Amino acid sequence: SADSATPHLDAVEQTLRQVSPGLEGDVWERTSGNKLDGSAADPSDWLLQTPGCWGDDKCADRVGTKRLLAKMTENIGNATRTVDISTLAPFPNGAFQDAIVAGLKESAAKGNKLKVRILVGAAPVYHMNVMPSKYRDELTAKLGKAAENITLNVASMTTSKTAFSWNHSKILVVDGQSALTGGINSWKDDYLDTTHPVSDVDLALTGPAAGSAGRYLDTLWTWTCQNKSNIASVWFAASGNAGCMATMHKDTNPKASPATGNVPVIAVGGLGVGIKDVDPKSTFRPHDNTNADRDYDTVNPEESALRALVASAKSHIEISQQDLNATCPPLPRYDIRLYDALAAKMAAGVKVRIVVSDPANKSLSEISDTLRNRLANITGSQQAAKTAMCSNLQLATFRSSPNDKWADGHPYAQHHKLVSVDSSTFYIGSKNLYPSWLQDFGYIVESPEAAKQLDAKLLDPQWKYSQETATVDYARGICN
Fold this sequence. Notes:
The chain has 480 residues and is of the alpha+beta class.
C-alpha cells in the first residue's frame, strides 16, 4: 500500500467535500503543482512578513515592507491580460496605490492592454468615504496615457447590513497565474509609515492555486454585477463604455493550469452572508452564524477548513492572531467548535501555542478560561482540565523585541491570520479565527520545507520575545 505525503491536506479536503461539495472549484479548491514565489537570492521570501524586524524595539530593518511593495509592483508589471484586486475599504491609497500605478505603467509600457478589477468591502459605518467613481478618476489621472490601455472595474459592496457582511479578502492575482494574499490591507492600516508598525503576513505563489483565487473573485464579482444597480448593496464605476466583468477570470484565463512547482495547496474562502444562502449539493448535517447556522457553514468552507486543520495535528499547533475572541455584538464571543477542537488536541497531549495581539491596541484570561471550560466538559473536572491545559498550552501576547512596548511608547500590535501544524501544513490568509461573517480567503499549504522556513523566520522569533508575557507555558511550568 502507498502512504500519502499530504495527510493534513487529505483531512481538510475530506471535510470540505462533506461541508461544501458544490462550491469546489469556486470558493475552495485543492491543487497540485504550485510554487512558493520566492526569488533565488532568498528562497524564503514567498513569506511576506511585515515589518520584518526582530530583536529591535526601533525596527530599523524594514526589508519586509520594502519587499512587499516591490513584489506588488513586479507582479503587476508582468501582467499581460488581467489584474484582480480585493481588500477591505478604503480603496488603495498611499504606498499601495503607488505600487499599483507603477506596476500598471510598467505593463502598459511593454505594450499590454489589461482588464483590471478593484473590489472593496465597506462597513455601513464607513460607506460615504468609499466613492468608486472618484477612485476611478484618481487612478486614471495618475496613470496618464497608460490609462488608454486599461479596462477598469471599481466597486465597493456590502452583502448584508443586518448580519454585518462585506468583503475582507486581500488578494492580488495577475493573469490568473500569480497570487498574493494574507492579512495586509494597506500601508497605513498596519502603521508602516510609523515607528510602531503592526506585524502581519502575506504569501506569494504562482501556479494553479492562483487560478483558484481568480475563481473566488469571479464568485464575488458575479454577485456584485448582479447587484450593481442596487445602491444599498453596491457602488460600481467603470472606465469608458466597459461593462461589469462578472467572470474576468473564467473568460481570459483557462482552467487547466500548468504546474510551476511541487507545492500542494488548498485555496479556501467564504461567501459571508447575502451572496449565497446555502450549498444546495451539500448533505452536511452537524442569531449566530458561527455556531448555530448549518447553511452558513456550507457557504463558508474556510471556517470548517481551519477547524479541520487544527484537527489534523498529530504533534503541535501554533496559532498567531489578532485575537481568538470577538467583541462585536451581535457576533458571538467565540467559535465553539474551534475551542472544542483545541481542547480535544490538548486532551490527547498535542501542544497548542496561541499568541494574540496586545489588548491595549485580561485578553489572555478570557482565552484560557474558555479553553479550561471546554476541557472540563471533556475531562470531567476542573482539576483534570487544568492538568491537560497547563501541561500542553503556551498562551501569550505578541512582542517583537525584549522591550515590553515599541521604543516610541505604543504597544505592539499584530494582524496575522496564521495557523501552523506539525511544522508541516499552514494557513495564511485574511480569515481571522475570532467570529466574523465576512467574505474571506486564504491558502492552506502542506510543505515541511516551507513550514520550517515559517518557523525559522516567523514563529520561532515570535515566541522568543512573546514568551515573556505568557500566562501559561508548559515548557517552563507557568500556569497562572
